[PDB]
Amino acid sequence: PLIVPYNLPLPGGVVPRMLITILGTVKPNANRIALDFQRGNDVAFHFNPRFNENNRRVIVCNTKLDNNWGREERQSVFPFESGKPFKIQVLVEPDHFKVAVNDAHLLQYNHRVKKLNEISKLGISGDIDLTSASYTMI
Ligand SMILES: Cc1ccc(S[C@@H]2O[C@H](CO)[C@H](O)[C@H](n3cc(-c4ccc(F)c(F)c4)nn3)[C@H]2O)cc1
Ligand SMILES: [Cl-]
């Protein structure tokens, strides 16, 4: 397995038609997972499954600018399960990141950070065994 937290460089940033695929297995009794598409110290797109926020499972998405988190976008569709293998696909589209889990569309996140070619790393963190993280053009 890859070491978590894992840094995946995205050379030259992201661009529409770039597909990022993350394969892993959620740990038993997981609490949290996070993907962080980063522009330097800013987080253009934070995708954060929370397994127990007040006894609810929720995905929280947000952007961090100058160390400040913005308005959260929340999704109660929660496709992850403790102990189980998953696939996350993040497709960069012109106006949003489009996320599918286990081949099922989950959510879109509109681009708040608009300099896509400066979003040049992806961090992967939290309660997973990480099998692979890669990108390709479709
Ligand atoms: C005013 C205020 C008060 C409280 C908050 S809470 C905050 O909410 C954010 C989204 O709005 C992020 O989720 C933040 N966060 C999570 C992780 C994180 C690290 C490692 C992992 F493995 C993981 F799974 C997640 N790092 N940073 C969280 O602290 C926010 C604003
Ligand atoms: Cl969290």
UniProtKB/Swiss-Prot annotation:
Gene Ontology CC: cell surface; collagen-containing extracellular matrix; cytoplasm; cytosol; extracellular exosome; extracellular region; extracellular space; ficolin-1-rich granule membrane
Motif (Nuclear export signal): 114-129
Record PTM Phosphoserine, positions in chain: 76
Residues covered by the Galectin domain: 6-136
Distribution of this protein across tissues and organs: A major expression is found in the colonic epithelium. It is also abundant in the activated macrophages. Expressed in fetal membranes.
GO biological process: eosinophil chemotaxis; epithelial cell differentiation; innate immune response; macrophage chemotaxis; monocyte chemotaxis; mononuclear cell migration; mRNA processing; negative regulation of endocytosis
Positions bound to a beta-D-galactoside: 69-75
Superkingdom of origin organism: Eukaryota
Key word Acetylation present: yes
Compartments in which it is found: Cytoplasm; Nucleus; Secreted
Keyword Lipoprotein recorded: no
Keywords per UniProt: Acetylation, Cytoplasm, Differentiation, Disulfide bond, IgE-binding protein, Immunity, Innate immunity, Lectin, mRNA processing, mRNA splicing, Nucleus, Phosphoprotein, Repeat, Secreted, Spliceosome
Gene Ontology MF annotations: carbohydrate binding; chemoattractant activity; disaccharide binding; IgE binding; laminin binding; molecular condensate scaffold activity; protein phosphatase binding; protein phosphatase inhibitor activity
Function as written in the Swiss-Prot or TrEMBL entry: Galactose-specific lectin which binds IgE. May mediate with the alpha-3, beta-1 integrin the stimulation by CSPG4 of endothelial cells migration. Together with DMBT1, required for terminal differentiation of columnar epithelial cells during early embryogenesis. In the nucleus: acts as a pre-mRNA splicing factor. Involved in acute inflammatory responses including neutrophil activation and adhesion, chemoattraction of monocytes macrophages, opsonization of apoptotic neutrophils, and activation of mast cells.
Quaternary assembly: Probably forms homo- or heterodimers. Interacts with DMBT1. Interacts with CD6 and ALCAM. Forms a complex with the ITGA3, ITGB1 and CSPG4. Interacts with LGALS3BP, LYPD3, ZFTRAF1 and UACA. Interacts with TRIM16; this interaction mediates autophagy of damage endomembranes. Interacts with cargo receptor TMED10; the interaction mediates the translocation from the cytoplasm into the ERGIC (endoplasmic reticulum-Golgi intermediate compartment) and thereby secretion.
UniProt protein name: Galectin-3
The species this protein was found in: Homo sapiens
Originating gene: LGALS3
First and last residues shown, out of full length: 113 to 250 of 250
